[PDB]
Design an enzyme around this catalytic site. Sequence first.
Site, PDB file in Angstrom:
ATOM      1  CB  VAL A 180      12.725  32.705  54.576  1.00 57.11           C
ATOM      2  CG1 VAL A 180      12.841  32.498  55.977  1.00 57.11           C
ATOM      3  CG2 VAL A 180      14.153  32.996  54.069  1.00 57.11           C
ATOM      4  CG  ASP A 217      10.908  22.672  41.826  1.00 55.10           C
ATOM      5  OD1 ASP A 217      11.662  22.199  41.173  1.00 55.10           O
ATOM      6  OD2 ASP A 217      11.179  23.616  42.456  1.00 55.10           O
ATOM      7  CG  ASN A 263      11.006  19.726  47.222  1.00 52.08           C
ATOM      8  OD1 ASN A 263      10.593  18.421  46.850  1.00 52.08           O
ATOM      9  ND2 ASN A 263      11.101  20.653  46.284  1.00 52.08           N
TER      10      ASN A 263
HETATM   11  O1  LIG Z   1      12.572  22.248  56.023  1.00 55.41           O
HETATM   12  C1  LIG Z   1      11.885  21.313  56.845  1.00 55.41           C
HETATM   13  N1  LIG Z   1      12.712  20.454  57.674  1.00 55.41           N
HETATM   14  C2  LIG Z   1      14.035  20.629  57.493  1.00 55.41           C
HETATM   15  C3  LIG Z   1      14.808  20.140  59.059  1.00 55.41           C
HETATM   16  C4  LIG Z   1      16.481  20.408  58.761  1.00 55.41           C
HETATM   17  C5  LIG Z   1      17.073  19.435  57.763  1.00 55.41           C
HETATM   18  N2  LIG Z   1      16.060  20.031  56.544  1.00 55.41           N
HETATM   19  C6  LIG Z   1      14.652  19.945  56.403  1.00 55.41           C
HETATM   20  C7  LIG Z   1      10.663  21.209  57.128  1.00 55.41           C
HETATM   21  N3  LIG Z   1       9.960  20.567  57.980  1.00 55.41           N
HETATM   22  N4  LIG Z   1       8.522  20.423  57.825  1.00 55.41           N
HETATM   23  C8  LIG Z   1       8.265  21.341  56.599  1.00 55.41           C
HETATM   24  C9  LIG Z   1       9.662  21.679  56.149  1.00 55.41           C
HETATM   25  N5  LIG Z   1       9.814  22.390  54.922  1.00 55.41           N
HETATM   26  C10 LIG Z   1       9.075  22.735  54.071  1.00 55.41           C
HETATM   27  O2  LIG Z   1       7.807  22.507  54.061  1.00 55.41           O
HETATM   28  C11 LIG Z   1       9.650  23.463  52.795  1.00 55.41           C
HETATM   29  C12 LIG Z   1      10.689  22.823  52.065  1.00 55.41           C
HETATM   30  F1  LIG Z   1      11.066  21.346  52.461  1.00 55.41           F
HETATM   31  C13 LIG Z   1      11.153  23.141  50.914  1.00 55.41           C
HETATM   32  C14 LIG Z   1      10.697  24.429  50.557  1.00 55.41           C
HETATM   33  C15 LIG Z   1       9.866  25.312  51.219  1.00 55.41           C
HETATM   34  C16 LIG Z   1       9.302  24.577  52.154  1.00 55.41           C
HETATM   35  F2  LIG Z   1       8.204  25.296  53.117  1.00 55.41           F
END
Ligand SMILES: O=C(N[C@H]1CCCNC1)c1n[nH]cc1NC(=O)c1c(F)cccc1F
Length: 272
Positions: free
Chosen positions: A17, A116, A121
């Site tokens: 999560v 993936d 992502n």
């Molecule tokens: O999810 C992120 N940002 C969100 C902000 C709101 C809109 N949406 C984006 C995010 N920011 N930095 C890292 C990150 N997310 C991830 O690294 C990530 C991902 F994008 C997908 C699966 C796992 C995970 F860790």
Amino acid sequence: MENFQKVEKIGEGTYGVVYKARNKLTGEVVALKKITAIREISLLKELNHPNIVKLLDVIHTENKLYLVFEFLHQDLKKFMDASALTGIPLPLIKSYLFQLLQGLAFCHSHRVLHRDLKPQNLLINTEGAIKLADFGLVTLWYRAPEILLGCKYYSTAVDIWSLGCIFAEMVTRRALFPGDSEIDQLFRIFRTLGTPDEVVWPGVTSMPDYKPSFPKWARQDFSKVVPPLDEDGRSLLSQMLHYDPNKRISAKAALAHPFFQDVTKPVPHLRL
Ligand SMILES: O=C(N[C@H]1CCCNC1)c1n[nH]cc1NC(=O)c1c(F)cccc1F
């Protein structure tokens, strides 16, 4: 985690999560993902590039694994949805595609595969930057055909395929191959690109999940597939979507493609 203050859930899915969170001594705002593994993860710590979301830290504790990432405010799926009425402007599409190609050229050169890639992502900022996230270590829509056909030792070509699918989607504002099972994904690909055979993909008929009983569709005209993309863009896309992984264009060669002759770095309009 003692040192982190949860702000909100920004991400869920398969394994972990993801929260927006605030570090308590640095004040840093971060994305915190809560989950051999430990050795390959620590290698990700060194995979640093401007188009790769930056892994700040890895906390292994009490049978939990936390990955701490730089926080970005938007992802490409949400941005696409938000841009559906108008469509992303071409020079922005072109900039995002070029940046992601740079990111993959880097990963790939270090023998790292993403595996993936999908819009959700792919993270974006106000600067016009786009970054690869959730390095693999709308589920199926971006899967390369050699994966669907049961190849266990697939190559960096799988990431090129996924990115071609994403490129088409930015352009048309509809998913290229929106399959809802593995056979539906495969057959949607076949319907568009033609059922592959030994002519276009030597060795295809010896793949683990290949069946001689697959229906045989003729391949459509790309002009039908991604209008109103120009001939440079279509030609690049067709090379990213080659059935044979060994013929599919590499990230590094794709950066040399004429499509990018006039590439620029526009800024998107974001709603924060
Ligand atoms: O999810 C992120 N940002 C969100 C902000 C709101 C809109 N949406 C984006 C995010 N920011 N930095 C890292 C990150 N997310 C991830 O690294 C990530 C991902 F994008 C997908 C699966 C796992 C995970 F860790």
